[PDB]
Amino acid sequence: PHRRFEYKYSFKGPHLVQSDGTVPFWAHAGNAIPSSDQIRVAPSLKSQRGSVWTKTKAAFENWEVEVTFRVTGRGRIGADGLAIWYAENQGLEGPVFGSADLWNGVGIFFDSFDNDGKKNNPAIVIIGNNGQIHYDHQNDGASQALASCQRDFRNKPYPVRAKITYYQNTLTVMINNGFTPDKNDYEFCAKVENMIIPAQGHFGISAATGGLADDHDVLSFLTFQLT
């Protein structure tokens, strides 16, 4: 399968922000702070929300995004986590990891905080939605999850990497857990066969905190069209 880099649906350093503090081709909101080499989507302060979404919609039959990020916090426990989005509408502000609920498309949620006390966090949870599901915060989306894995993406020596592929109707999530310098040491995390998502969507990334708070940083969001 051929890969085409798509600049208009991507961002990265080392000149990530423009002199007016904007990120080219993306809109940010809440308390996201863009800087020259990363976006602090939500800093380690109480009750924060931030997001970053593409200004325009992508129309790709198949795609792959690589998101390189850090979640960092004093505790062995942190909150709330970080979400990667492909959705019909920009979800700039809202209660779902800092973005709009009732989205149409897919959220991949990197959920640090064990809301339902099931000792199964940090987790990565894939959640499809059609415009009508209210995200179940209290249960870490457990009943709404098309698929999930357990993976501790917090406080790692190198950046964590999520490779998210939509190809021939299957959504795969692969994670490089950041233990070593090898940027290609990916491990399988989850997969959903026969996933339907809009033919046009905004990509996005968002994060939030509560009483506990980590710094949520995205160094780069890199989007490819597959054919």
Per the annotation, binding residues for Ca(2+) are 111, 113, 115, 140
Strand pairing of 147-150 and 123-130? antiparallel
Contact partners, residue 92, CB within 8 Å, separation at least 6: 27, 29, 30, 51, 53, 99, 100
Options 17-25, 124-132, 140-148, 157-165: segment touching Ca ion (CB under 5 A): 140-148
Q: Is 4 in the site for Ca ion (CB under 5 A)?
A: no
Which of Ca ion, another protein, Cl ion, none is residue 10 near (CB under 5 to 8 Å by kind)?
Answer: another protein
Q: Is 120 in the site for Ca ion (CB under 5 A)?
A: yes
| Member of 45, 47, 55, 118 binding another protein (CB under 8 A) | 55
Size of the site for Cl ion (CB under 5 A): 5
Contact 86, 211 (CB under 8 A): no
Q: Is 115 in the site for Ca ion (CB under 5 A)?
A: yes
**CB burial of residue 82 (10 Å; 0-12, 13-18, 19+):** buried
Residue in the structure block whose two tokens are 């004093």: 74
CA dist 44 and 155 (Å) reads: 13
| Member of 1, 8, 169, 179 binding another protein (CB under 8 A) | 8
- According to DSSP, residue 96 is labeled B
Torsion-angle region of residue 146: left (phi > 0), alpha (psi -120 to 50) or beta? alpha
* Cβ-based nearer residue to Ca ion, 88 or 111: 111
Q: Is 181 in the site for another protein (CB under 8 A)?
A: no
| Member of 114, 136, 152, 185 binding Ca ion (CB under 5 A) | 114
Report the interface residues with another protein, using CB under 8 A. Answer: 2-8, 10-15, 18-20, 24-25, 55, 224-225
